Protein backbone atom coordinates (compact mmCIF):
# COMPACT_ATOMS: atom_id res chain seq x y z
CA UNK A 1 0.00 0.00 0.00
CA UNK A 2 1.25 3.44 1.01
CA UNK A 3 4.31 1.73 2.57
CA UNK A 4 5.90 1.45 -0.87
CA UNK A 5 5.96 5.23 -1.23
CA UNK A 6 7.86 5.71 2.03
CA UNK A 7 10.31 2.98 1.00
CA UNK A 8 10.65 4.65 -2.41
CA UNK A 9 11.37 8.09 -0.94
CA UNK A 10 13.94 6.69 1.50
CA UNK A 11 15.57 4.35 -1.04
CA UNK A 12 18.46 6.61 -2.08
CA UNK A 13 19.65 6.94 1.52
CA UNK A 14 19.71 10.77 1.52
CA UNK A 15 16.64 11.22 3.76
CA UNK A 16 16.01 10.30 7.41
CA UNK A 17 12.23 10.72 7.60
CA UNK A 18 9.25 10.77 5.25
CA UNK A 19 5.45 10.69 5.54
CA UNK A 20 2.22 10.95 3.52
CA UNK A 21 -0.55 12.65 5.50
CA UNK A 22 -4.20 13.04 4.61
CA UNK A 23 -5.39 16.57 5.47
CA UNK A 24 -8.97 16.49 4.19
CA UNK A 25 -11.74 15.70 6.71
CA UNK A 26 -9.71 14.24 9.57
CA UNK A 27 -5.90 14.60 9.21
CA UNK A 28 -4.22 11.23 9.61
CA UNK A 29 -0.77 9.78 8.98
CA UNK A 30 -1.20 7.30 6.12
CA UNK A 31 2.38 6.02 6.29
CA UNK A 32 5.56 7.37 7.95
CA UNK A 33 9.05 6.12 8.84
CA UNK A 34 8.90 4.18 12.20
CA UNK A 35 10.47 5.53 15.37
CA UNK A 36 11.05 8.93 13.83
CA UNK A 37 9.43 12.38 13.91
CA UNK A 38 6.74 12.58 11.19
CA UNK A 39 4.97 9.49 12.48
CA UNK A 40 3.84 11.70 15.42
CA UNK A 41 2.30 14.53 13.40
CA UNK A 42 -0.98 15.73 14.97
CA UNK A 43 -4.19 17.10 13.39
CA UNK A 44 -3.37 20.47 14.99
CA UNK A 45 0.07 20.67 13.32
CA UNK A 46 -1.53 19.77 9.96
CA UNK A 47 -4.08 22.52 10.55
CA UNK A 48 -1.29 25.05 10.83
CA UNK A 49 0.29 23.78 7.60
CA UNK A 50 -2.83 24.22 5.46
CA UNK A 51 -3.84 27.31 7.45
CA UNK A 52 -4.82 30.85 6.49
CA UNK A 53 -1.99 32.50 8.49
CA UNK A 54 0.84 32.43 5.96
CA UNK A 55 3.19 34.94 7.62
CA UNK A 56 2.75 34.42 11.37
CA UNK A 57 4.95 31.30 11.26
CA UNK A 58 7.76 33.40 9.77
CA UNK A 59 8.99 34.88 13.06
CA UNK A 60 7.81 31.96 15.16
CA UNK A 61 8.16 28.80 13.08
CA UNK A 62 5.99 25.72 13.64
CA UNK A 63 6.08 22.12 14.85
CA UNK A 64 5.92 18.80 12.98
CA UNK A 65 5.72 15.73 15.22
CA UNK A 66 6.75 17.93 18.13
CA UNK A 67 9.88 19.06 16.29
CA UNK A 68 10.16 22.86 16.02
CA UNK A 69 10.89 24.05 12.52
CA UNK A 70 11.71 27.36 10.82
CA UNK A 71 9.79 28.19 7.64
CA UNK A 72 12.38 29.46 5.16
CA UNK A 73 10.03 29.76 2.16
CA UNK A 74 6.24 29.32 2.03
CA UNK A 75 4.50 28.47 -1.25
CA UNK A 76 2.22 25.66 -0.06
CA UNK A 77 -1.04 27.25 -1.25
CA UNK A 78 0.46 28.76 -4.39
CA UNK A 79 -0.64 27.83 -7.91
CA UNK A 80 2.09 25.59 -9.32
CA UNK A 81 4.86 25.67 -6.71
CA UNK A 82 2.77 23.82 -4.06
CA UNK A 83 5.73 23.43 -1.70
CA UNK A 84 7.15 24.73 1.54
CA UNK A 85 10.73 24.66 2.72
CA UNK A 86 11.82 24.48 6.35
CA UNK A 87 14.82 23.83 8.56
CA UNK A 88 14.93 21.99 11.86
CA UNK A 89 15.28 24.57 14.65
CA UNK A 90 18.64 23.95 16.30
CA UNK A 91 17.60 26.08 19.28
CA UNK A 92 19.55 23.54 21.31
CA UNK A 93 21.62 20.51 20.37
CA UNK A 94 23.42 21.05 17.06
CA UNK A 95 22.29 19.27 13.85
CA UNK A 96 19.80 21.06 11.59
CA UNK A 97 18.12 19.33 8.65
CA UNK A 98 16.17 20.45 5.60
CA UNK A 99 12.51 19.51 5.33
CA UNK A 100 10.06 20.05 2.49
CA UNK A 101 6.27 19.76 2.70
CA UNK A 102 4.43 19.38 -0.63
CA UNK A 103 0.66 19.39 -1.07
CA UNK A 104 -1.65 17.46 -3.35
CA UNK A 105 -5.44 17.22 -3.49
CA UNK A 106 -5.81 14.91 -0.51
CA UNK A 107 -2.33 14.51 0.91
CA UNK A 108 0.73 16.26 2.30
CA UNK A 109 4.04 14.59 1.36
CA UNK A 110 6.73 15.31 3.95
CA UNK A 111 10.49 14.70 3.52
CA UNK A 112 13.45 15.22 5.87
CA UNK A 113 17.00 14.93 4.60
CA UNK A 114 20.04 13.68 6.45
CA UNK A 115 22.69 16.06 7.78
CA UNK A 116 24.49 17.86 4.97
CA UNK A 117 21.97 16.92 2.28
CA UNK A 118 21.27 19.91 -0.01
CA UNK A 119 17.80 21.38 0.54
CA UNK A 120 16.95 21.55 -3.16
CA UNK A 121 17.57 17.83 -3.35
CA UNK A 122 14.90 17.27 -0.72
CA UNK A 123 12.63 19.69 -2.60
CA UNK A 124 13.12 17.82 -5.89
CA UNK A 125 12.35 14.45 -4.31
CA UNK A 126 9.34 15.70 -2.38
CA UNK A 127 7.97 17.70 -5.29
CA UNK A 128 8.23 14.91 -7.83
CA UNK A 129 6.41 12.43 -5.57
CA UNK A 130 3.48 14.82 -5.15
CA UNK A 131 3.46 15.55 -8.87
CA UNK A 132 3.05 11.80 -9.38
CA UNK A 133 0.30 11.76 -6.73
CA UNK A 134 -1.78 14.60 -8.12
CA UNK A 135 -1.64 13.24 -11.67
CA UNK A 136 -2.96 10.02 -10.10
CA UNK A 137 -5.99 11.91 -8.75
CA UNK A 138 -4.46 12.27 -5.27
CA UNK B 1 -15.57 4.25 4.12
CA UNK B 2 -15.59 0.78 2.58
CA UNK B 3 -17.39 1.79 -0.64
CA UNK B 4 -14.20 3.61 -1.67
CA UNK B 5 -12.43 0.24 -1.86
CA UNK B 6 -15.20 -0.92 -4.19
CA UNK B 7 -14.68 2.16 -6.40
CA UNK B 8 -10.92 1.72 -6.34
CA UNK B 9 -11.22 -2.00 -7.25
CA UNK B 10 -13.71 -1.25 -10.06
CA UNK B 11 -11.80 1.68 -11.61
CA UNK B 12 -9.69 0.03 -14.33
CA UNK B 13 -12.65 -1.73 -15.93
CA UNK B 14 -11.26 -5.26 -15.64
CA UNK B 15 -13.78 -6.27 -12.98
CA UNK B 16 -17.55 -6.62 -13.12
CA UNK B 17 -18.13 -7.35 -9.43
CA UNK B 18 -16.35 -6.78 -6.09
CA UNK B 19 -17.10 -7.08 -2.35
CA UNK B 20 -15.57 -6.76 1.10
CA UNK B 21 -17.22 -9.27 3.42
CA UNK B 22 -16.80 -9.45 7.18
CA UNK B 23 -16.71 -13.12 8.18
CA UNK B 24 -15.83 -12.90 11.88
CA UNK B 25 -18.60 -13.05 14.50
CA UNK B 26 -21.69 -12.21 12.40
CA UNK B 27 -20.81 -12.23 8.67
CA UNK B 28 -22.14 -9.44 6.44
CA UNK B 29 -21.37 -7.50 3.26
CA UNK B 30 -19.51 -4.34 4.28
CA UNK B 31 -19.50 -3.15 0.68
CA UNK B 32 -20.36 -4.63 -2.73
CA UNK B 33 -21.56 -3.65 -6.21
CA UNK B 34 -25.33 -2.99 -6.21
CA UNK B 35 -27.23 -4.87 -8.88
CA UNK B 36 -24.60 -7.61 -9.09
CA UNK B 37 -23.90 -11.04 -7.53
CA UNK B 38 -21.52 -10.72 -4.53
CA UNK B 39 -23.88 -8.27 -2.88
CA UNK B 40 -26.20 -11.26 -2.30
CA UNK B 41 -23.69 -13.51 -0.50
CA UNK B 42 -25.27 -15.25 2.48
CA UNK B 43 -23.80 -15.96 5.94
CA UNK B 44 -24.17 -19.64 5.07
CA UNK B 45 -21.99 -19.15 2.00
CA UNK B 46 -19.47 -17.15 4.01
CA UNK B 47 -19.43 -20.00 6.50
CA UNK B 48 -18.64 -22.45 3.72
CA UNK B 49 -15.70 -20.34 2.56
CA UNK B 50 -14.05 -20.15 5.99
CA UNK B 51 -14.93 -23.55 7.50
CA UNK B 52 -11.97 -25.90 8.10
CA UNK B 53 -13.74 -28.69 6.22
CA UNK B 54 -13.04 -28.25 2.49
CA UNK B 55 -14.93 -31.36 1.41
CA UNK B 56 -17.69 -29.90 -0.80
CA UNK B 57 -15.34 -27.72 -2.90
CA UNK B 58 -13.92 -30.86 -4.45
CA UNK B 59 -17.38 -32.46 -4.50
CA UNK B 60 -19.10 -30.00 -6.86
CA UNK B 61 -17.89 -26.44 -6.18
CA UNK B 62 -19.71 -23.79 -4.16
CA UNK B 63 -21.98 -20.77 -4.68
CA UNK B 64 -21.30 -17.07 -4.22
CA UNK B 65 -24.54 -15.10 -3.92
CA UNK B 66 -26.31 -17.98 -5.66
CA UNK B 67 -23.75 -18.12 -8.48
CA UNK B 68 -22.19 -21.59 -8.66
CA UNK B 69 -18.45 -21.75 -9.19
CA UNK B 70 -15.77 -24.38 -9.71
CA UNK B 71 -12.73 -24.34 -7.38
CA UNK B 72 -9.50 -24.13 -9.36
CA UNK B 73 -7.34 -23.79 -6.28
CA UNK B 74 -8.10 -23.45 -2.58
CA UNK B 75 -5.37 -21.92 -0.40
CA UNK B 76 -7.78 -19.57 1.39
CA UNK B 77 -7.07 -20.91 4.86
CA UNK B 78 -3.40 -21.54 4.09
CA UNK B 79 -1.04 -19.05 5.76
CA UNK B 80 1.13 -16.85 3.55
CA UNK B 81 -1.18 -17.60 0.62
CA UNK B 82 -4.74 -16.91 1.83
CA UNK B 83 -6.23 -17.12 -1.67
CA UNK B 84 -8.73 -19.18 -3.65
CA UNK B 85 -9.15 -19.18 -7.45
CA UNK B 86 -12.58 -19.95 -8.84
CA UNK B 87 -14.44 -19.86 -12.14
CA UNK B 88 -18.20 -19.28 -12.57
CA UNK B 89 -20.19 -22.19 -13.99
CA UNK B 90 -22.42 -21.50 -16.96
CA UNK B 91 -25.24 -23.11 -18.87
CA UNK B 92 -25.22 -22.93 -22.65
CA UNK B 93 -22.47 -21.07 -24.42
CA UNK B 94 -22.70 -18.23 -21.92
CA UNK B 95 -19.29 -17.06 -20.72
CA UNK B 96 -17.44 -18.03 -17.57
CA UNK B 97 -15.52 -15.54 -15.45
CA UNK B 98 -12.50 -15.75 -13.17
CA UNK B 99 -13.21 -15.14 -9.51
CA UNK B 100 -10.65 -14.74 -6.73
CA UNK B 101 -11.28 -14.72 -2.99
CA UNK B 102 -8.58 -13.61 -0.55
CA UNK B 103 -8.88 -13.48 3.23
CA UNK B 104 -7.48 -11.17 5.90
CA UNK B 105 -7.95 -10.94 9.67
CA UNK B 106 -11.50 -9.63 9.55
CA UNK B 107 -12.31 -9.55 5.85
CA UNK B 108 -12.91 -11.61 2.66
CA UNK B 109 -12.18 -9.72 -0.61
CA UNK B 110 -14.08 -10.92 -3.71
CA UNK B 111 -13.47 -10.02 -7.37
CA UNK B 112 -15.14 -11.22 -10.57
CA UNK B 113 -13.37 -10.43 -13.79
CA UNK B 114 -15.13 -9.57 -17.00
CA UNK B 115 -15.10 -11.98 -19.93
CA UNK B 116 -11.58 -12.16 -21.37
CA UNK B 117 -9.64 -10.85 -18.34
CA UNK B 118 -7.00 -13.38 -17.27
CA UNK B 119 -7.29 -15.02 -13.84
CA UNK B 120 -3.74 -13.96 -13.07
CA UNK B 121 -4.71 -10.31 -13.36
CA UNK B 122 -7.72 -10.89 -11.06
CA UNK B 123 -5.54 -12.70 -8.53
CA UNK B 124 -2.99 -9.86 -8.33
CA UNK B 125 -5.55 -7.08 -7.82
CA UNK B 126 -7.22 -9.10 -5.06
CA UNK B 127 -3.99 -10.19 -3.33
CA UNK B 128 -2.74 -6.60 -3.43
CA UNK B 129 -5.95 -5.35 -1.85
CA UNK B 130 -5.66 -8.10 0.80
CA UNK B 131 -2.03 -7.27 1.67
CA UNK B 132 -2.94 -3.58 2.16
CA UNK B 133 -5.77 -4.50 4.55
CA UNK B 134 -3.74 -6.95 6.62
CA UNK B 135 -1.05 -4.28 7.02
CA UNK B 136 -3.72 -2.02 8.60
CA UNK B 137 -4.59 -4.90 10.93
CA UNK B 138 -7.75 -5.74 9.02
Amino acid sequence: GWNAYIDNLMADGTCQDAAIVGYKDSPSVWAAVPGKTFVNITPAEVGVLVGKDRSSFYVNGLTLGGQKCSVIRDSLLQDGEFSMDLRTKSTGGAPTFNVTVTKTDKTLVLLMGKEGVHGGLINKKCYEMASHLRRSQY
Amino acid sequence: GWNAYIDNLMADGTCQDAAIVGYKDSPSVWAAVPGKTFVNITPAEVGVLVGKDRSSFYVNGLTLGGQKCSVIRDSLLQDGEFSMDLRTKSTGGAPTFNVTVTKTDKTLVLLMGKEGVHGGLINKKCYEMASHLRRSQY
Binding site: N8 | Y5, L133, S136
Partner: peptide, 10 residues
Protein backbone atom coordinates in the same frame (compact mmCIF):
# COMPACT_ATOMS: atom_id res chain seq x y z
CA UNK C 1 6.49 5.04 -9.47
CA UNK C 2 3.73 2.70 -8.14
CA UNK C 3 -0.02 3.29 -8.60
CA UNK C 4 -1.92 5.07 -5.82
CA UNK C 5 -2.72 2.71 -2.90
CA UNK C 6 -6.14 2.08 -1.36
CA UNK C 7 -7.26 4.71 1.14
CA UNK C 8 -6.82 3.94 4.82
CA UNK C 9 -9.50 1.70 6.37
CA UNK C 10 -12.96 3.21 7.31
Amino acid sequence: PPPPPPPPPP
